[PDB]
Design a protein around this ligand. Sequence first.
Ligand code: HEC
Ligand code: HEC
Ligand code: 327
Ligand code: 327
Ligand code: CL
Ligand code: CL
Ligand code: ZN
Lengths: 399, 401
Amino acid sequence: FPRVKNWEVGSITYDTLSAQAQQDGPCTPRRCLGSLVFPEQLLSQARDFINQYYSSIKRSGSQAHEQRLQEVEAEVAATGTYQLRESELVFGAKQAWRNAPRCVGRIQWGKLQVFDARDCRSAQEMFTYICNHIKYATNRGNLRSAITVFPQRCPGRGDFRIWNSQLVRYAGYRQQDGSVRGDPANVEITELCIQHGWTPGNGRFDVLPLLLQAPDEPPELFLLPPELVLEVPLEHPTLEWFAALGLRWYALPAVSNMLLEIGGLEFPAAPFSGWYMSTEIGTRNLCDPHRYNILEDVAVCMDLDTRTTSSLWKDKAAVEINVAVLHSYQLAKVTIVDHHAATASFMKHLENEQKARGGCPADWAWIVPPISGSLTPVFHQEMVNYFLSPAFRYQPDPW
Amino acid sequence: KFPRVKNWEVGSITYDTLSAQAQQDGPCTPRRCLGSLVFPPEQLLSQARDFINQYYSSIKRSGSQAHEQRLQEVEAEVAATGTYQLRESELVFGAKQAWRNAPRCVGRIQWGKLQVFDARDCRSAQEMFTYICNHIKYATNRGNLRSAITVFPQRCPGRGDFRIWNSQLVRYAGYRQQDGSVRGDPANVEITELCIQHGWTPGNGRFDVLPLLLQAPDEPPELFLLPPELVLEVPLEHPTLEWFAALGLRWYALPAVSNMLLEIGGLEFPAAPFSGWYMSTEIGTRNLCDPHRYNILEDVAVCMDLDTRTTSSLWKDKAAVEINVAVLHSYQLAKVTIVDHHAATASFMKHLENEQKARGGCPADWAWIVPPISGSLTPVFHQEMVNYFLSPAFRYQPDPW
Ligand code: HEC
Ligand code: HEC
Ligand SMILES: CCC[C@H]1COc2ccsc2C(=N)N1
Ligand SMILES: CCC[C@H]1COc2ccsc2C(=N)N1
Ligand SMILES: [Cl-]
Ligand SMILES: [Cl-]
Ligand SMILES: [Zn+2]
């Protein structure tokens, strides 16, 4: 049993949950790879998922429990798979999020709105489902967490897939001169949409159309009514010239390319969303050199000295950009949380989870924010990373 | 299958074939990763043979008569005495590899330029103290810092070891004031009290240099005071925030780890202090802003007149940044060697590139290589890393008391 210690406070504990890890990770006693970004087995996984559920409603070992088990086994034996019950799906989704090692916002895992789109039959339907999801979750600015689950993977049938990595993202157009107008991170998907019949725009913040895929069909292009896509223009509380830079970002962070795994079942298409932690926008999206890379320009405008790295001109500009994002989102009344408030809440989460399950899978490298790391509580907290199921998983691109 | 390491900023890829030769076992298992944990006879001969081979391989004389004789020579020494002795040329080589192999060190581009002082002829605590003072002088060099390490007698069978009780040659005392608080560096409360328990008459300042507690084999630790003219220090001041200087903050110039164990070819050296120079973030961010350290963030944010009422104003980020600026400013001003996290991380990327060509890999601890503030603004954040343990190495050992 792994001993876990917090070095700021000094307290220690023992991750007894780690022992129950479902799948295997990349690390071996020979070398750690924690910093890398990336039939009888169906039944076993399914039986375990059923157990977690009946344990979640304090009905473990009941008649209902045993029948549910026999029913799933009967189904698998006959169709090679089985269908979950509504209550199970809801419970599963929450656990997947609960078990996400890289999500710093898990204090909220119990408040998740689940939309059941398992009856979805076409791309056009997928779109209608997605738009309702976006409307509900955006909720005019007071964001609400939600996930929409589409049909599960099937024996003898293609999968449902959303080609985009997010429900909302800006286009990236490779200019001739090697530069990129828009989000460099989205050049491939931007080109795929064009390849499929979309005439592009030419702005830096063009919301990309959706490339939705129904089983064994080519993907279909859909355009999100702008009315549905809430955005925040970025301004600074005192640096007046910032507003004039014409920057902005969308309110809804919605991952749509991961797979949801519950009791041996896989949902290649189950988009989930919540709200942003300011650093993601202020630091990663706007400052990564391979993203919008605005750090230098901002500094020049801040009339800072960029000749020497030791002046810490970079840290200065980044900090002000993060302030603008926070200021701006609060101004537009759109949910957002800073890295301090978020990390503090996560320390609370670890505590609850210790009492609840005796541990909590966590990825130190992803929990610590991209700036002011040691200024946040999690930086001084040891963590154990392991894979538990239900879970959200990465999967290859459909193309 | 060799691990695939990718840089996400550039997209470049390499394979770490050097990790398959990992000498020690790490904490992780395929069941769970413990990467973030701070503390993770024939066996000797197999470690000595490997070291000797590394050595002859380094002077490109592997497989020569001199090589074979050196192997046979250490085997006989072990058969006869249960241990063996290194030659000066080997000790030097070993200490360097030990630095080169340290996963948590971002200043590794400089590994080949380590100056090794052989104090294996040390006979007492008094001599240790002399060697340490010399090291400090040579290394401090009036502000133009030089990397060095002084190796004291190796651990012996049927005999106690040499040990320097302090975790560092230069540290500030920590006095637990009556009311909970701590005057000085909270981190050195225990070592401070041990110096007192052993006859030290304390001070009452915030930056009181601690005396050294040196241990000779089978001897209670003797106490020694460092000549003030030896301990070079830096008064901290900000370049534009004139009130900073008035906070009377300061830090020493010499970063010297003295409580780690140096291992070479199965041989262990419980005492072998080493030093180089600081990376700004270590002083301004960790030592001065850690809540369990000098924890001065609020006092500064206040003097900066920032709204500390709400976290969302990032007042902590602003205060910290300025403090780091002050550290850099003060050191550059005082002509004391120092490097910021942008340059340090940038050079480390060069080191990764050098090592990939030299050994087909580099053991790196991502969580320690990434600076405490402004992580993703430095190039190491976007670099995947593989962590493993190669020997020679600097290791942690339990406190002598
Ligand atoms: C309640 C608001 C909320 C906040 C704030 C939040 N999350 Fe996450 N989150 C994840 C998963 C899965 C990952 C790992 C994703 C990855 O590697 O990008 C993640 C990762 C993250 C990360 C780090 C990954 C990155 O790209 O930097 C942050 C920060 C984060 N979540 C913040 C599933 C969720 C779900 C699913 C039902 C919900 C709701 C959710 N997350 C809600 C939230
Ligand atoms: C050339 C100047 C130089 C710089 C700058 C430097 N080092 Fe290190 N360094 C280490 C070891 C060993 C560790 C891991 C130590 C630990 O966990 O305390 C380390 C860790 C570090 C760390 C991270 C640990 C922390 O406390 O935050 C930094 C930053 C660092 N070194 C900077 C041995 C060395 C040696 C030994 C011959 C030399 C010389 C050395 N280091 C020279 C340098
Ligand atoms: C660009 C999307 C990354 C996203 C990870 O996933 C979620 C899901 C809900 S909020 C959230 C988040 N803060 N960042
Ligand atoms: C408080 C000392 C930690 C020390 C780690 O060890 C070395 C050794 C030479 S410089 C250096 C350093 N930058 N920090
Ligand atoms: Cl994003
Ligand atoms: Cl220090
Ligand atoms: Zn690991």
